[PDB]
Amino acid sequence: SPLSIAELGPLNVYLQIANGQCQTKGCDEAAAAYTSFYTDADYPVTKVLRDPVYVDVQILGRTDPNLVLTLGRCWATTSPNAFSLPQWDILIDGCPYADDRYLSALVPIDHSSGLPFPTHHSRFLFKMFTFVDPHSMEPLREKVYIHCSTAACVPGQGVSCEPSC
Amino acid sequence: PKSCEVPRDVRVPCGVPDISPSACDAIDCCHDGQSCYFGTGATVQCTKDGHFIVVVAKDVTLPHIDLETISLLGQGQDCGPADSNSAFAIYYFPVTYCGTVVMEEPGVIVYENRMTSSYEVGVGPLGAITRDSSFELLFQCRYRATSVETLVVEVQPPD
Amino acid sequence: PAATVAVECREDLAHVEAKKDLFGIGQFIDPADLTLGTCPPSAEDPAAQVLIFESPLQNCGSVLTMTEDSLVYTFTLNYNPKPLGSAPVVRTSQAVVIVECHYPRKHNVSSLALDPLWVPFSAAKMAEEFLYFTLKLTTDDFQFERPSYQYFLGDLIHIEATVKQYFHVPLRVYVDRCVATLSPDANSSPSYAFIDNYGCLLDGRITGSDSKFVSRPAENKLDFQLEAFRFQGADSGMIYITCHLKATSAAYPLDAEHRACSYIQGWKEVSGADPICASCESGGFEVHANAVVSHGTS
Ligand SMILES: *[C@@H]1O[C@H](CO)[C@@H](O[C@@H]2O[C@H](CO)[C@@H](O[C@@H]3O[C@H](CO[C@H]4O[C@H](CO)[C@@H](O)[C@H](O)[C@@H]4O)[C@@H](O)[C@H](O[C@H]4O[C@H](CO)[C@@H](O)[C@H](O)[C@@H]4O[C@@H]4O[C@H](CO)[C@@H](O[C@@H]5O[C@H](CO)[C@H](O)[C@H](O)[C@H]5O)[C@H](O)[C@H]4NC(C)=O)[C@@H]3O)[C@H](O)[C@H]2NC(C)=O)[C@H](O)[C@H]1NC(C)=O
């Protein structure tokens, strides 16, 4: 019987790479990284192989603390197009890719992070690499791009908003 | 460029005790006044008994080079690192072994061998990656093969 | 309500506009009777006759739901009329309007370009050392070094030249010259090159001797014998012998400059490759010949 009105509204997700530097030798490097993030001018960003790349994925401009950002598959490409090949897997089903020796890792984002809405963020790290032509097993000498599928999630429903791993 | 700024916990001594500074220089080593040690980089030494000696700093590449990835021109039990510390790897094998190529030149016998490192590749369904560098070293032994030898005799008429 | 309740859905906030003539009845409602959940209207538009609510999506009695495509914030704009003054009377009917704000739930994100870095290594190295030889007087079987260096005329001086093989590829030794002198100086006069021209043992050729290259017990060894002698004006007995020794791999082809030759009724090569020695018969040496006279009977 009653009336019902409905409309759309924006909801945005943003991915950035951390550039925080350890305060002094001995600090917690993983924590120190996310104290700063690269800007657009800084790219393309040079990072040596095997080095830790700290990534932060975030919902922008929301104020509801019940929202939980959940990551799906996070992968890498040789070109800007995320559907382009070849691809390497960093996260699958929200949990580190298992067939990589230099295993990726999820970074807990607990109160120690001290974020206004820590639920809106999801952080993870991977070890820097370069793509190789499998036939010749030689460096492709091409840039790398990092991509993630994300979903905003609501706890208390029938769905789970955290990755079991 | 090769430099001798090696700290004392990882120095590899060069195998001639109480060698003089200029002799230690001749073997392509470093001398600090009290000791002789291998410098920073790749060092090649050919010794009198016909054995290769190679010293390689693991920091010649970024990221550092692993000791399994490196392989010589031929396979064998003696072709792996003979010794190693946290910073250097030491190879010691006969000039006959490990696929060494022998060349002939006028007055010198030339041995040649080659270190190559192979990327370890992670392969996935849709990609292939590596996190290693490459290391290639071509080293030779040029054994000079002529000398002036002498002897003496005394000949007396029979008596 | 048909066009009464409109909504704008923003990132953090919902903005609801209701027409003051909520029911299209010509008579405006009490803005105190219209509540979004339990929230009163925020402002008024005396020109558009619009009661304006603004609530962050988690406030004002909002229910949040999940679907495949979207997140849904569902509000309830409730109009509960109250008595029109001291009179216990109401002239409107109660109503509720459902306000929904949809938000795209799923997204994919990308980073900007990363550039991998590594330092490869490529260099060439050379190193040097010497092959080491031995030249030693030996015994009649070229088996042991001779304890003494003294000989009589007509004896054989047995000498062996060896290149020490150690771990090298099979080596062959060569003796391409030997100069005999009275003084240790190899250029001193008198001097006699009993071996010369790259291995030619010219003694047996010029002196008519049995001096020859006996044999090679191993490729890195070469045995030869030299029948003793003295110089014409020599008062001293000691004679100094200085030789050039060479070496190659056993796989190096025997050559006119890589040979060990001796004149035995014809130039002869130890190892049997006799033709190699053809060029030992050069100029510069004069074969000895004893004189001749006619036949007489004693
Ligand atoms: C956000 O990011 C997400 C993560 O990156 C994105 O999701 C990805 O989207 C891509 C593109 O759609 C998907 O790729 C497809 O995946 C399916 C299934 O993959 C499974 O396995 C992977 C393992 O890694 C899992 O991750 C995944 O979840 C699934 O379990 C593949 O089948 C697809 O391959 C086919 O399509 C591609 C093009 O898309 C072709 O290049 C390829 O050759 C394949 O072609 C098919 O070939 C078969 C034969 O093998 C054909 O079948 C034949 O058909 C004929 C005619 O009909 C006849 O019947 C024959 O009998 C029959 O055999 C078939 O017709 C071909 N189909 C084509 C060409 O379409 C492809 O790889 C990713 O899987 C997906 N990942 C995840 C995790 O979901 C998401 O899209 C992003 N969102 C946005 C908005 O950007």
XYZ file of C-alpha atoms and ligand atoms in Angstrom:
708
model
C 0.000 0.000 0.000
C 2.527 2.683 1.050
C 4.510 4.893 -1.300
C 8.172 4.118 -1.988
C 10.879 6.351 -3.483
C 14.309 5.145 -4.594
C 17.413 6.686 -6.152
C 21.089 5.943 -6.757
C 24.067 7.366 -4.909
C 27.836 7.239 -5.373
C 30.185 4.896 -3.519
C 33.890 4.952 -4.347
C 36.915 2.751 -3.623
C 40.540 3.885 -3.889
C 43.845 1.983 -4.013
C 47.204 3.549 -3.140
C 50.779 2.385 -2.504
C 52.498 3.242 0.777
C 55.757 5.204 0.991
C 56.255 5.454 4.759
C 59.830 5.215 6.021
C 60.875 3.474 9.235
C 61.333 6.098 11.943
C 64.623 4.670 13.212
C 66.375 1.366 12.606
C 64.502 -1.219 14.678
C 61.001 0.186 14.196
C 58.078 -1.934 12.982
C 58.505 -1.537 9.223
C 55.040 -2.828 8.315
C 53.417 -0.195 10.528
C 55.772 2.594 9.444
C 54.946 2.047 5.764
C 51.251 3.028 5.914
C 52.068 6.366 7.629
C 52.464 7.852 4.132
C 51.254 7.074 0.613
C 52.615 7.879 -2.840
C 50.924 10.618 -4.852
C 50.312 10.578 -8.608
C 53.392 12.694 -9.353
C 55.622 10.035 -7.780
C 54.766 7.460 -10.486
C 56.125 5.448 -12.173
C 57.555 4.193 -8.863
C 60.806 2.236 -8.910
C 61.013 -0.659 -6.453
C 63.659 -3.379 -6.463
C 62.809 -7.058 -6.758
C 61.855 -8.938 -3.556
C 61.165 -5.653 -1.710
C 57.919 -5.322 0.269
C 55.203 -3.310 -1.474
C 52.604 -2.132 1.045
C 49.130 -1.498 -0.369
C 46.041 0.136 1.145
C 42.536 -0.208 -0.325
C 39.898 2.124 1.030
C 36.302 3.296 0.728
C 36.185 7.068 0.286
C 33.932 9.632 1.909
C 31.650 7.334 3.907
C 30.816 7.817 7.587
C 28.936 4.606 8.499
C 31.312 2.508 10.654
C 29.284 -0.675 10.037
C 30.565 -0.893 6.449
C 33.410 -3.371 5.963
C 35.589 -3.317 2.851
C 36.325 -6.882 1.723
C 38.926 -7.762 -0.899
C 38.471 -10.545 -3.427
C 41.194 -11.199 -5.990
C 44.212 -8.882 -6.092
C 46.452 -9.486 -9.100
C 49.157 -7.891 -11.249
C 49.498 -7.136 -14.960
C 52.109 -5.885 -17.417
C 49.856 -3.120 -18.787
C 47.326 -0.692 -17.256
C 44.427 -2.875 -18.450
C 43.648 -5.221 -15.564
C 42.032 -7.777 -17.888
C 45.248 -7.856 -19.941
C 47.665 -10.774 -19.829
C 49.966 -12.044 -18.433
C 48.713 -11.982 -14.832
C 50.135 -12.858 -11.428
C 47.980 -13.522 -8.371
C 48.628 -11.737 -5.080
C 45.335 -12.436 -3.280
C 42.627 -14.973 -4.132
C 39.279 -15.108 -2.294
C 40.768 -12.530 0.059
C 43.596 -14.845 1.137
C 47.247 -14.799 -0.029
C 48.064 -16.702 -3.200
C 49.515 -20.035 -2.105
C 51.602 -21.083 -5.134
C 54.018 -18.157 -4.655
C 57.179 -18.803 -2.649
C 57.525 -15.100 -1.826
C 54.108 -15.325 -0.203
C 51.895 -12.268 0.020
C 50.512 -11.230 3.395
C 47.477 -9.473 4.808
C 48.205 -6.635 7.239
C 45.889 -6.490 10.289
C 44.410 -3.001 10.523
C 43.413 -3.050 14.198
C 43.174 -0.079 16.566
C 46.970 0.191 16.461
C 46.471 1.662 12.982
C 44.354 4.394 14.567
C 42.155 5.052 11.558
C 38.862 6.987 11.710
C 37.051 4.009 10.151
C 39.439 1.037 10.132
C 36.650 -1.151 8.726
C 36.642 0.910 5.513
C 40.269 -0.071 4.822
C 41.874 -3.357 3.806
C 45.671 -3.578 3.659
C 48.004 -6.190 2.173
C 51.650 -6.577 1.165
C 53.422 -8.426 -1.634
C 57.057 -8.905 -2.638
C 58.169 -6.983 -5.711
C 58.695 -8.941 -8.920
C 58.984 -8.561 -12.687
C 57.063 -10.496 -15.319
C 58.945 -13.075 -17.388
C 58.360 -14.650 -20.781
C 57.771 -18.293 -19.742
C 59.075 -19.610 -23.071
C 62.496 -17.930 -22.816
C 62.468 -17.559 -19.001
C 63.912 -14.061 -19.429
C 62.809 -10.733 -17.918
C 60.008 -9.045 -19.837
C 61.445 -5.649 -18.813
C 57.930 -4.222 -18.603
C 56.128 -2.182 -15.960
C 53.790 -3.725 -13.379
C 50.299 -2.691 -12.264
C 48.423 -3.838 -9.149
C 44.659 -4.437 -9.230
C 42.039 -5.598 -6.733
C 38.403 -6.621 -6.830
C 36.561 -5.221 -3.816
C 33.136 -5.419 -2.202
C 31.569 -3.241 0.462
C 30.103 -5.534 3.093
C 27.613 -5.280 5.947
C 28.086 -7.467 9.049
C 25.080 -8.848 10.864
C 23.568 -10.059 7.597
C 23.995 -13.663 6.479
C 27.314 -12.801 4.834
C 30.815 -12.639 6.314
C 32.952 -9.525 5.860
C 36.377 -10.981 6.687
C 38.582 -13.545 4.938
C 39.134 -16.885 6.650
C 42.616 -18.134 5.727
C 85.233 -1.351 -10.002
C 86.850 -3.543 -7.345
C 87.481 -2.082 -3.888
C 89.151 -3.561 -0.815
C 86.750 -2.032 1.742
C 85.792 -5.430 3.168
C 85.018 -5.767 6.907
C 87.042 -8.232 8.910
C 84.276 -10.735 9.737
C 83.667 -11.786 6.105
C 87.110 -11.335 4.541
C 88.357 -14.346 2.572
C 92.141 -14.743 3.013
C 94.243 -15.391 -0.087
C 96.026 -18.707 0.119
C 99.655 -17.732 0.641
C 100.384 -16.983 4.327
C 102.880 -14.203 5.127
C 102.711 -13.130 1.468
C 104.114 -9.669 0.760
C 101.843 -6.741 -0.174
C 103.062 -6.615 -3.788
C 102.765 -10.398 -4.179
C 99.261 -10.212 -2.702
C 98.642 -7.552 -5.358
C 99.992 -9.921 -8.018
C 97.381 -12.536 -7.081
C 94.710 -9.802 -7.465
C 94.091 -9.655 -3.694
C 94.092 -6.892 -1.078
C 96.634 -6.077 1.633
C 96.043 -3.880 4.689
C 99.567 -4.123 6.129
C 98.812 -7.084 8.414
C 96.881 -9.515 6.188
C 96.001 -10.397 2.590
C 92.358 -10.894 1.621
C 90.102 -10.972 -1.421
C 88.654 -7.655 -2.545
C 85.118 -6.637 -3.440
C 83.868 -8.172 -6.673
C 84.747 -11.244 -8.736
C 88.304 -12.547 -8.394
C 90.017 -15.112 -10.631
C 93.181 -16.944 -9.564
C 95.065 -19.685 -11.408
C 97.511 -21.617 -9.241
C 100.529 -23.755 -9.948
C 98.866 -27.180 -9.678
C 96.250 -26.496 -12.363
C 93.196 -25.552 -10.296
C 90.802 -22.675 -10.854
C 90.117 -20.419 -7.875
C 87.155 -18.032 -8.109
C 85.903 -15.676 -5.391
C 82.600 -13.897 -6.025
C 80.912 -11.342 -3.790
C 77.242 -12.224 -3.381
C 76.524 -8.479 -3.689
C 77.697 -8.282 -7.320
C 73.981 -8.272 -8.215
C 70.870 -6.658 -6.738
C 69.092 -8.616 -5.294
C 72.108 -10.663 -4.204
C 72.823 -13.752 -6.290
C 72.081 -17.198 -4.869
C 74.606 -20.034 -4.976
C 72.297 -22.617 -6.563
C 71.248 -20.452 -9.513
C 74.871 -20.199 -10.708
C 76.115 -23.023 -12.933
C 79.402 -23.491 -14.758
C 79.981 -24.449 -18.391
C 79.852 -28.113 -17.370
C 78.166 -30.078 -14.614
C 79.885 -32.062 -11.898
C 80.340 -32.636 -8.202
C 83.322 -30.248 -8.070
C 81.499 -27.445 -9.918
C 79.531 -26.245 -6.895
C 80.734 -23.652 -4.386
C 83.624 -25.155 -2.448
C 83.225 -22.742 0.480
C 81.020 -19.806 1.417
C 80.458 -17.185 4.114
C 77.675 -14.627 4.503
C 79.169 -12.376 1.788
C 81.455 -14.425 -0.511
C 81.343 -17.737 -2.379
C 84.492 -19.719 -3.205
C 84.904 -22.094 -6.160
C 87.835 -24.496 -6.461
C 88.062 -27.109 -9.215
C 90.693 -28.492 -11.618
C 91.167 -26.798 -14.978
C 90.335 -30.205 -16.475
C 86.888 -30.408 -14.856
C 83.505 -28.680 -15.187
C 83.364 -28.328 -18.955
C 86.418 -26.079 -19.153
C 87.371 -25.241 -22.744
C 91.070 -25.534 -23.611
C 92.525 -23.302 -26.329
C 96.017 -23.262 -27.815
C 98.047 -20.113 -28.451
C 101.762 -19.683 -29.209
C 103.601 -20.153 -25.924
C 100.535 -20.290 -23.652
C 97.815 -22.836 -22.847
C 94.486 -21.063 -22.306
C 91.663 -22.507 -20.199
C 88.189 -20.955 -20.279
C 85.008 -21.440 -18.263
C 81.813 -19.489 -17.725
C 79.477 -18.856 -14.788
C 75.805 -18.328 -15.626
C 72.857 -17.870 -13.270
C 69.370 -19.024 -14.252
C 66.238 -17.226 -13.099
C 63.963 -19.255 -10.858
C 60.538 -18.640 -12.395
C 57.223 -18.813 -10.594
C 54.636 -20.036 -13.089
C 50.912 -19.503 -12.728
C 47.931 -20.229 -14.965
C 48.097 -16.783 -16.604
C 51.620 -15.542 -15.884
C 55.283 -16.203 -15.213
C 57.447 -14.097 -12.889
C 60.917 -13.957 -11.368
C 62.415 -12.090 -8.414
C 66.064 -12.910 -9.204
C 68.808 -11.011 -10.996
C 71.341 -12.377 -13.494
C 75.041 -13.080 -12.971
C 77.458 -13.914 -15.798
C 81.223 -14.269 -15.337
C 83.683 -15.323 -18.050
C 87.087 -16.259 -16.632
C 90.275 -17.676 -18.129
C 93.620 -19.161 -17.126
C 96.540 -18.344 -19.437
C 99.361 -20.717 -18.443
C 102.607 -19.570 -20.079
C 104.349 -22.621 -21.452
C 108.037 -21.978 -22.127
C 111.137 -21.785 -19.954
C 114.934 -21.741 -19.988
C 116.306 -24.749 -18.108
C 119.957 -25.559 -17.584
C 122.410 -28.098 -16.208
C 126.161 -28.669 -15.958
C 128.516 -31.506 -16.864
C 132.224 -32.177 -16.441
C 133.985 -34.216 -19.136
C 137.463 -35.636 -18.535
C 139.543 -37.810 -20.876
C 139.783 -41.397 -19.623
C 142.470 -41.813 -16.972
C 1.906 11.324 -1.680
C 2.764 11.037 -5.401
C 5.482 13.622 -6.185
C 5.749 14.786 -2.568
C 8.766 12.841 -1.278
C 11.965 13.232 -3.315
C 15.470 12.180 -2.308
C 19.099 12.834 -3.185
C 21.543 10.086 -2.152
C 25.111 11.219 -1.419
C 28.177 9.359 -0.191
C 27.753 10.097 3.520
C 24.277 11.619 3.628
C 20.673 11.341 2.465
C 18.775 14.532 1.589
C 14.982 14.130 1.661
C 12.561 16.783 0.381
C 8.830 16.633 1.145
C 6.174 18.947 -0.252
C 4.411 20.870 2.514
C 1.099 19.962 0.870
C 2.057 16.343 1.435
C -1.292 14.912 0.345
C -1.988 17.358 -2.486
C -5.027 18.540 -0.511
C -4.277 22.272 -0.713
C -3.695 22.469 3.056
C -0.132 22.244 4.354
C 0.844 19.860 7.139
C 2.460 20.597 10.492
C 6.246 20.218 10.008
C 6.303 18.854 13.569
C 4.026 15.967 12.530
C 6.381 14.723 9.768
C 9.377 12.766 11.066
C 11.994 10.729 9.188
C 12.113 7.881 11.667
C 12.229 10.010 14.799
C 14.135 12.931 13.199
C 12.376 16.253 12.529
C 12.825 18.181 9.275
C 16.041 20.175 9.048
C 14.878 23.259 7.132
C 12.062 24.878 5.160
C 11.772 26.214 1.600
C 9.123 28.969 1.823
C 9.396 29.348 -1.978
C 9.268 25.653 -2.970
C 7.093 24.582 -0.005
C 9.578 21.814 0.781
C 10.425 20.335 4.175
C 14.057 19.236 3.942
C 15.585 16.380 5.937
C 19.304 15.612 5.978
C 20.600 12.524 7.762
C 23.886 10.624 7.485
C 22.879 7.249 6.131
C 23.348 5.387 9.438
C 21.078 7.773 11.409
C 17.349 8.577 11.579
C 15.955 5.059 11.795
C 17.779 3.693 8.753
C 17.936 -0.003 7.844
C 20.951 -1.186 5.828
C 20.582 -4.189 3.518
C 22.825 -6.118 1.137
C 21.979 -7.197 -2.404
C 24.098 -8.497 -5.265
C 24.477 -5.108 -6.941
C 24.007 -2.574 -4.165
C 23.825 -1.540 -0.541
C 20.354 -0.276 0.392
C 19.646 2.331 3.080
C 15.894 2.246 3.745
C 14.357 5.096 5.748
C 10.777 5.686 6.870
C 9.265 9.161 6.551
C 6.325 8.930 8.967
C 3.491 11.476 9.132
C 1.626 11.135 12.436
C -0.908 13.985 12.707
C -1.571 15.430 16.150
C -4.603 17.344 17.466
C -5.123 20.770 15.892
C -4.744 22.766 19.091
C -6.846 22.488 22.234
C -9.336 20.576 20.072
C -8.823 16.743 20.295
C -9.423 16.595 16.549
C -7.348 15.679 13.489
C -8.232 16.515 9.875
C -5.562 14.417 8.103
C -4.850 10.700 7.816
C -1.720 8.974 9.077
C 0.813 7.859 6.480
C 4.331 6.509 5.954
C 6.665 6.780 2.951
C 9.581 4.431 2.252
C 12.810 6.103 1.104
C 15.581 3.932 -0.357
C 19.127 4.895 -1.336
C 21.001 2.370 -3.474
C 24.798 2.336 -3.624
C 26.986 0.255 -5.975
C 28.491 -2.446 -3.779
C 31.249 -4.030 -5.891
C 34.205 -2.311 -7.547
C 37.610 -3.034 -9.053
C 40.613 -0.780 -8.497
C 44.026 -0.370 -10.089
C 47.363 1.141 -9.105
C 49.625 3.353 -11.177
C 52.744 2.019 -12.865
C 55.404 0.262 -10.806
C 58.863 -0.126 -12.362
C 60.925 -3.145 -11.210
C 64.630 -2.635 -10.614
C 67.615 -4.959 -10.446
C 71.348 -4.724 -11.099
C 72.600 -7.461 -13.470
C 76.243 -8.534 -13.607
C 78.433 -9.130 -16.668
C 82.235 -9.064 -16.692
C 85.311 -10.814 -18.063
C 88.426 -11.854 -16.149
C 91.854 -13.200 -17.080
C 94.486 -14.800 -14.859
C 97.973 -16.172 -15.427
C 100.553 -18.653 -14.120
C 103.416 -20.708 -15.566
C 103.896 -24.288 -16.654
C 106.873 -25.699 -14.757
C 109.653 -27.775 -16.322
C 112.548 -29.936 -15.162
C 115.849 -30.547 -16.976
C 117.971 -33.144 -15.196
C 120.819 -35.546 -15.902
C 119.536 -39.093 -15.450
C 120.691 -42.713 -15.463
C 121.180 -45.215 -18.287
C 117.468 -46.106 -18.091
C 116.410 -42.441 -17.718
C 114.850 -43.544 -14.432
C 116.746 -41.738 -11.643
C 118.624 -38.448 -11.444
C 122.354 -39.059 -11.735
C 124.152 -38.382 -8.416
C 127.211 -36.865 -10.152
C 127.829 -34.639 -13.170
C 131.213 -36.084 -14.203
C 131.733 -38.175 -17.337
C 134.552 -39.661 -19.391
C 135.057 -39.133 -23.101
C 133.028 -41.725 -24.977
C 130.364 -42.020 -22.286
C 126.726 -41.128 -22.952
C 125.227 -38.174 -21.085
C 121.608 -39.156 -20.456
C 119.240 -36.202 -20.032
C 115.458 -35.954 -19.645
C 113.302 -32.865 -20.196
C 109.920 -32.934 -18.447
C 106.947 -30.590 -18.117
C 105.170 -31.251 -14.837
C 101.569 -32.111 -15.643
C 99.801 -31.822 -12.261
C 96.097 -31.357 -13.090
C 96.644 -29.963 -16.591
C 95.290 -31.424 -19.829
C 97.739 -34.085 -21.142
C 100.862 -32.092 -21.975
C 103.725 -32.758 -24.373
C 107.210 -31.347 -23.779
C 109.556 -30.078 -26.483
C 113.240 -29.172 -26.467
C 113.871 -26.854 -29.421
C 117.417 -25.687 -28.624
C 120.381 -26.470 -26.383
C 123.632 -24.478 -26.325
C 126.789 -25.846 -24.687
C 129.312 -23.310 -23.386
C 132.371 -23.145 -21.152
C 131.136 -20.077 -19.328
C 127.603 -20.009 -17.847
C 126.724 -17.354 -20.451
C 124.799 -19.091 -23.243
C 126.101 -16.491 -25.729
C 129.747 -16.959 -24.745
C 132.320 -18.311 -27.173
C 133.086 -21.153 -27.768
C 129.543 -22.550 -28.005
C 127.926 -25.586 -29.629
C 124.200 -26.008 -30.325
C 123.928 -29.784 -30.203
C 120.129 -29.329 -30.379
C 118.711 -26.587 -32.606
C 116.206 -25.647 -35.339
C 113.187 -26.645 -33.245
C 114.203 -30.060 -31.961
C 116.883 -31.154 -34.442
C 119.528 -33.083 -32.483
C 122.238 -32.022 -34.906
C 125.033 -33.701 -32.934
C 124.535 -37.126 -34.510
C 124.361 -35.410 -37.913
C 127.415 -33.156 -37.672
C 129.623 -35.385 -35.482
C 128.553 -38.806 -36.773
C 127.438 -39.849 -33.295
C 124.748 -42.039 -31.774
C 123.316 -38.977 -30.004
C 119.570 -39.319 -30.511
C 116.145 -38.830 -28.941
C 115.705 -42.228 -27.294
C 111.968 -42.142 -26.585
C 109.127 -40.455 -24.702
C 108.089 -42.506 -21.633
C 105.151 -40.097 -21.371
C 104.086 -37.231 -23.606
C 105.250 -34.772 -20.939
C 108.718 -36.413 -20.994
C 111.424 -36.542 -23.671
C 114.570 -38.637 -23.237
C 117.727 -38.008 -25.253
C 121.380 -39.012 -24.993
C 124.423 -36.914 -25.912
C 127.807 -38.595 -26.315
C 130.339 -36.650 -24.266
C 132.827 -34.198 -25.743
C 135.266 -31.357 -25.086
C 136.070 -28.117 -26.888
C 139.289 -27.750 -28.863
C 141.020 -25.141 -26.707
C 139.358 -26.113 -23.445
C 141.565 -26.366 -20.373
C 138.600 -26.561 -17.985
C 136.520 -29.714 -17.781
C 133.160 -28.239 -16.820
C 130.686 -27.551 -19.628
C 127.444 -25.602 -19.210
C 124.318 -26.657 -21.128
C 121.416 -24.216 -21.558
C 118.205 -25.307 -23.283
C 114.895 -23.845 -24.426
C 111.948 -25.997 -23.354
C 108.382 -25.700 -24.658
C 105.095 -27.485 -24.013
C 101.638 -27.884 -25.535
C 98.655 -30.202 -25.234
C 99.030 -33.744 -26.523
C 96.239 -32.787 -28.946
C 98.404 -30.105 -30.581
C 99.530 -31.368 -34.018
C 103.198 -32.187 -34.398
C 104.756 -29.427 -36.477
C 108.049 -28.386 -38.035
C 108.525 -26.212 -34.937
C 107.029 -28.870 -32.605
C 109.201 -31.958 -32.993
C 112.072 -34.009 -31.574
C 114.376 -35.134 -34.386
C 117.650 -37.056 -34.517
C 119.812 -38.167 -37.445
C 119.982 -41.978 -37.465
C 120.907 -42.966 -41.033
C 118.395 -40.280 -41.957
C 116.528 -37.710 -39.883
C 114.206 -39.603 -37.544
C 111.281 -38.483 -35.384
C 110.677 -39.977 -31.974
C 107.000 -40.991 -32.179
C 107.840 -42.253 -35.680
C 106.527 -39.262 -37.676
C 109.797 -39.127 -39.584
C 108.825 -36.795 -42.490
C 108.338 -33.920 -40.028
C 112.134 -33.852 -39.716
C 112.841 -33.131 -43.398
C 113.721 -29.489 -42.679
C 116.352 -30.368 -40.052
C 118.720 -30.777 -43.030
C 119.193 -27.041 -43.410
C 122.263 -24.988 -44.164
C 124.529 -23.614 -41.485
C 125.902 -27.000 -40.388
C 128.728 -28.932 -42.062
C 128.731 -32.714 -41.705
C 132.094 -34.082 -40.608
C 134.009 -36.369 -42.954
C 137.304 -38.118 -42.253
C 139.929 -37.906 -44.983
C 140.778 -40.457 -47.691
C 143.831 -42.015 -49.354
C 144.431 -44.824 -51.843
C 144.551 -48.517 -50.975
C 147.737 -50.070 -49.653
C 148.508 -53.519 -48.293
C 150.423 -53.830 -45.023
C 37.032 -7.412 -11.292
O 38.140 -8.326 -11.168
C 37.789 -9.715 -11.293
C 39.061 -10.503 -11.087
O 40.026 -10.210 -12.089
C 37.144 -9.971 -12.651
O 36.716 -11.325 -12.720
C 37.390 -12.003 -13.794
O 36.839 -11.747 -15.096
C 37.508 -12.463 -16.146
C 36.913 -11.996 -17.455
O 35.520 -12.259 -17.523
C 37.351 -13.962 -15.917
O 38.049 -14.672 -16.931
C 37.279 -15.807 -17.368
O 37.179 -16.816 -16.386
C 36.454 -17.994 -16.819
C 36.337 -18.941 -15.626
O 37.553 -18.873 -14.875
C 37.548 -19.842 -13.802
O 38.880 -20.122 -13.380
C 39.615 -19.009 -12.781
C 41.010 -19.540 -12.419
O 41.897 -18.430 -12.253
C 38.833 -18.453 -11.567
O 39.483 -17.280 -11.052
C 37.379 -18.102 -11.981
O 36.644 -17.612 -10.861
C 36.676 -19.296 -12.636
O 36.509 -20.259 -11.600
C 37.197 -18.630 -18.002
O 36.474 -19.749 -18.481
C 37.347 -17.600 -19.120
O 38.052 -18.170 -20.209
C 37.239 -18.023 -21.390
O 37.009 -16.647 -21.701
C 38.172 -15.864 -22.056
C 37.683 -14.442 -22.284
O 37.031 -13.999 -21.098
C 38.835 -16.481 -23.281
O 40.024 -15.763 -23.590
C 39.188 -17.945 -22.989
O 39.793 -18.533 -24.138
C 37.972 -18.737 -22.536
O 37.126 -18.796 -23.651
C 36.150 -19.815 -23.446
O 36.652 -21.026 -23.967
C 35.773 -22.134 -23.758
C 36.534 -23.387 -24.130
O 37.599 -23.631 -23.224
C 34.529 -21.913 -24.599
O 33.638 -23.000 -24.377
C 33.183 -23.509 -25.641
O 32.128 -22.724 -26.180
C 31.609 -23.204 -27.438
C 30.565 -22.157 -27.880
O 29.635 -21.888 -26.858
C 31.074 -24.636 -27.306
O 29.932 -24.637 -26.467
C 32.174 -25.542 -26.727
O 31.604 -26.821 -26.509
C 32.694 -24.945 -25.426
O 33.735 -25.778 -24.949
C 33.858 -20.603 -24.209
O 32.833 -20.312 -25.152
C 34.844 -19.427 -24.172
N 34.220 -18.281 -23.520
C 34.467 -16.993 -23.800
C 35.470 -16.723 -24.879
O 33.899 -16.078 -23.199
C 38.018 -16.328 -18.613
O 39.368 -16.663 -18.275
C 37.914 -14.335 -14.553
O 37.676 -15.713 -14.296
C 37.262 -13.495 -13.463
N 37.849 -13.794 -12.167
C 37.127 -13.937 -11.050
C 37.903 -14.233 -9.802
O 35.905 -13.835 -11.046
C 35.943 -9.054 -12.839
O 35.395 -9.227 -14.141
C 36.358 -7.600 -12.650
N 35.211 -6.719 -12.794
C 35.249 -5.580 -13.492
C 33.971 -4.798 -13.542
O 36.271 -5.194 -14.055
